[model samples]
Target: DGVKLCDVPSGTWSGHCGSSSKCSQQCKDREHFAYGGACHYQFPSVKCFCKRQC
Candidate 1:
């Protein structure tokens, strides 16, 4: 069974998915999650997803 631990609506970045590294930082610092992080380039709306699993 693979369940991904997830993200919160970004508290730091509110623009398009500029840099994934920046997204990860926002997730770690602003959002406060333990799994590094990632962003989705969905155009119109970019979202940062914080997650990790075994």
Candidate 2:
């Protein structure tokens, strides 16, 4: 199996107060694992990346 990056649905956190835990849980709920998350300086929100086997 190979790993691929999947967009976590409704995973955009709009603010600095966003929590990774919540975003990660969203990924887990969709049968995926939260790979990592980061705040995009150019964007106004935090993007969560989810990993899954494809």
Candidate 3:
């Protein structure tokens, strides 16, 4: 019943990536909440997404 989780595409990514590790690093460093990012399949490409709560 506290703040729920949310997802966001990386604003700093500038473009898509092939995998999650890089995205995870960027998310951890920039967004906080060390669980960080995951790569999403969007058919046309991938985006760095973050899972956050708090």
- Which prediction has the highest TM-score against the true structure? 3
| RMSD in Å for all candidates | 3.3, 4.5, 3.2
**Per-model TM-score versus the true fold:** 0.58, 0.39, 0.67
What is the C-alpha RMSD, rounded to one decimal, of candidate 1?
3.3
Provide the lowest-lDDT 10-residue window in model 3: 1-10
**Candidate-wise lDDT, in order:** 0.66, 0.48, 0.74
lDDT of 1 by residue, 1-54 (tens): 566775555656777766778778777776446566778755578777565443
lDDT tens digits, residues 5-49, model 2? 554334444445256666566556754464643223335545554
Q: Which ranges in model 1 have alpha carbons more than 4 Å from their true place?
A: 1-3, 52-54
Q: What is the lDDT for 38 in model 2?
A: 29
Question: Which of the numbered candidates is closest to the native, going by highest lDDT?
Answer: 3
Collision pairs in model 1: none
Candidate 2 segments whose C-alpha is farther than 4 A from its true place: 1-17, 34-42, 51-54
Stretches of candidate 3 exceeding 4 Å from the true structure: 1-5
